[model samples]
Target: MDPPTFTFNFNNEPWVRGRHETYLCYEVERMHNDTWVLLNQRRGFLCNQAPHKHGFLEGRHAELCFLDVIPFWKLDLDQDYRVTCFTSWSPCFSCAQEMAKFISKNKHVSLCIFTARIYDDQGRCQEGLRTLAEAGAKISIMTYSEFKHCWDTFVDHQGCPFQPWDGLDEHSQDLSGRLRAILQ
Candidate 1:
């Protein structure tokens, strides 16, 4: 198996089913018009790594990696920024907590996370997502438009197009409902 690299192979099968590490493909930008207008300055992906545990360096979560790299300082303070990220997992509790802090302090920039799968649907994860929402971030399960958008811009499809999995509709709805309950 190859690295996810935002590739089609990475997106298919067990990986999308959450049998893999958390991956995040992000676009640090603002909503433009009726659509997302890219900052277009950069585009790529990040994966949560095995933590250093007892070492000098600590491994960062996928969400935090994006937070650290996003040029929030360069973004206009007067204008609104809706940075979108497509993550394989809904944020882990710590990431959600920190993300809440990031937006709380930044104010002008709000994160929009479209997750393929919610990490822990109940208990801990539920409160985290709700906390994130209250802090201003919008979290949605990836719908058709979101999948298509990530495919077009983030996925390394090369010449091929996005092909939805067999459970795309059925499972997305189930996961979305779970999120609805969480956010509600």
Candidate 2:
């Protein structure tokens, strides 16, 4: 037998059950040669209940990605380091708490999270967002323009620029309002 292998599809037909349709990515930055350099980049997805199984533990994308970063790198407490995260859905209450705990303990790292939507089906998400905010995580909803930013920053588009959809403001306003309510 070979070593267990785990893979996640960040993009798939959502109508299909057990497919992880959400995408979460992060960029870690540190100073090198007197200039900020991207030290690491990672992409993750929410749990997919697909039939295939691996021995590795499964968890939320935010949590999984954070775990992936811990082994090779130790944050510099003396200098400002930054981690920017982009996700299809904002973290749930549990994940938010975990991330908040990590951020609170790590003084050098500043987290800025951009999400397309907030997951609040359980009605406790506001508290979670509040915890993250109190821990100094900057959270914002991804506008259409921000989506293009993600494309330019993270995606490997073959030179095709992002085209904003009509009524972009409507979607941005809705998500922005929800984030504000949660923060408040």
Could you tell me every candidate's TM-score relative to the true structure? 0.79, 0.72
Each model's lDDT: 0.73, 0.63
- Please give, for residues 119-178, the per-residue lDDT of candidate 2 as tens digits: 665577788889999999999987766676666665556576665556556767877887
Which residue pairs in candidate 2 have backbone atoms (N, alpha carbon, C) closer than 3 angstroms, thus clashing?
A: none
Per-residue accuracy of model 1 over 1-184 as CA lDDT, tens digit each = 1224454323423244435577788776654547555445356777776578674267777787777777553455666666788887789888999999999998777688898778884567888999999998999988767777877876656657777767677777887888898788
TM-score of model 2 vs. true structure: 0.72
- Report how far off residue 182 is in candidate 2 (Å): 1.2
